[PDB]
Amino acid sequence: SKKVLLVDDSAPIRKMVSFVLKKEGYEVIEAENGQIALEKLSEFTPDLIVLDIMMPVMDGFTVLKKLQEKEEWKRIPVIVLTAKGGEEDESLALSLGARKVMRKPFSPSQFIEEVKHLLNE
Ligand SMILES: [Mg+2]
Numbered sequence: 001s002k003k004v005l006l007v008d009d010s011a012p013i014r015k016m017v018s019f020v021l022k023k024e025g026y027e028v029i030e031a032e033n034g035q036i037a038l039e040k041l042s043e044f045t046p047d048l049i050v051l052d053i054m055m056p057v058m059d060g061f062t063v064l065k066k067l068q069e070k071e072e073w074k075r076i077p078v079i080v081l082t083a084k085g086g087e088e089d090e091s092l093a094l095s096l097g098a099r100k101v102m103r104k105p106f107s108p109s110q111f112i113e114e115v116k117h118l119l120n121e
Contacts, residue, residue, distance in 0.1 A: 002119050003027045003044070007037040007063065008052035008081070013106070017050060017081070020108040021115070034058030038066055045072055047119060051098070053082040053089065064096035077118045081106065 004026050006014050011032070018028045029046060031037035035058040037051075049067075053060035060080060067073045080093045080101045090101040100114055 001025050001027050002047040003029060004115070005029045005031065005037065005040065005046040005049045007031040007034065007049065007055070007060070009033055009055040010052075013052075013104075016106065016108075017111070020112055024112060024116075026115075034060060034063040034066075037063060041073060046076060048115065049076055049078045050115075051078050051080050053080065053084050053093070061092060061096060064093065064098060068097055077121065079111075079114060079118065081111075 004021050006017055006028055008014050009032055014030050018030070021028050029040060029044070031040055033055045051060045051063055060082065064078065067076065067078065077099045078097065080098045081104065082089065082101065083104045085103050093101045099118060102111065102114065
């Protein structure tokens with residue numbers, strides 16, 4: 001089954017998103033901040049990353065910068081899922097390599113369509 005890394009400092013958000021992913025039969029790996037995410041990425045390669053922006057220790061923009069600095073990481077599709085609604089926040093995430101920027105409030109239907117689309121690229 002496809003593996004998804006979910007990176008967000010709100011466990012309740014991760015749990016909600018995980019339920020939607022698990023319903024499609026995907027395996028889910030979680031991370032509470034950007035540093036924890038990169039640590040886990042040293043040891044495995046997911047098929048997709050779902051990435052929050054505002055997080056303690058290391059934010060999502062810094063994560064995107066670090067993903068570009070490794071051959072085995074740079075090709076993993078990233079969906080940014082964030083409460084940052086600004087056109088400027090979206091611009092920066094896309095410039096740093098994110099495939100899509102999705103805004104909270106979260107929609108499982110909108111989300112899963114995008115996840116399936118990217119996994120079937
Ligand atoms: Mg956050």
